[PDB]
């Protein structure tokens, strides 16, 4: 398992514009297009992202390119963030993937707000971190995914993903 396989499981793959769990226009492997209710706005963002007139549909290669860019952006967001970088640097490789997963889903600023969880992770208090992480809108709104990510933080193993 690696971060690409992990997020591919969590986000799926759809080649036509769809709505994510929050009702936002998205495409590919969880590539958010816009939070605007306008499908036309989403199609414009798509065309800009891909560099051609897509009419709301992309190829698998294009989806994978956006995914590469998005994972890269998540990692860079972590490294540039004064709250996230020290925690990330303190983690082992598997737990780093859990961090990237969270940043991919909710953004750098969102994750940086998990102050108490971040401290517990930095302190390697895994069970306590897991308990704290679950006290969140994140967990309540996407519990199956949050549970997988949290199990990854708790154990430092891929146990929550391996069968998927």
From Swiss-Prot:
Q: What is the effect of changing residue 132 to I?
A: 5-fold decrease in enzymatic activity
Effect of altering residue 30 to A?
Answer: Almost complete loss of enzymatic activity
In what way does activity depend on pH?
Optimum pH is 7.3.
Superkingdom of the source species: Viruses
Explain the induction of this protein: Expressed late in the viral replication.
Q: Does the keyword Hydrolase apply?
A: yes
The entry's active site is 11 (proton donor/acceptor), 20 (proton donor/acceptor)
Give GO cellular component annotations, separated by semicolons.
Answer: host cell cytoplasm
Q: What is the effect of changing residue 20 to E/Q?
A: Loss of 99% of enzymatic activity
List keywords of the entry alphabetically: Antimicrobial, Bacteriolytic enzyme, Cytolysis, Glycosidase, Host cell lysis by virus, Host cytoplasm, Hydrolase, Viral release from host cell
What's the effect of swapping residue 26 to H? Facilitates transglycosylation more effectively than hydrolysis; covalently bound substrate
A Pfam family per the record: Phage_lysozyme
Principal location class: host cell
A GO MF annotation of the entry reads: lysozyme activity
Q: Which reaction does it catalyse?
A: Hydrolysis of (1->4)-beta-linkages between N-acetylmuramic acid and N-acetyl-D-glucosamine residues in a peptidoglycan and between N-acetyl-D-glucosamine residues in chitodextrins
GO biological process entries: cell wall macromolecule catabolic process; defense response to bacterium; peptidoglycan catabolic process; viral release from host cell by cytolysis
Report the outcome of residue 11 to Q.
Complete loss of activity
Mutation effect (residue 30 to F): Almost complete loss of enzymatic activity. The enzyme is destabilized by 1.5 kcal/mol
SUPFAM superfamilies recorded: Lysozyme-like
UniProt similarity note? Belongs to the glycosyl hydrolase 24 family.
Question: Which PANTHER family does the record associate with it?
Answer: T4-TYPE LYSOZYME 1-RELATED
Q: What is this protein called?
A: Endolysin
Q: Which organism is it from?
A: Enterobacteria phage T4
From the UniProt record, report the name of the gene that encodes this protein.
E
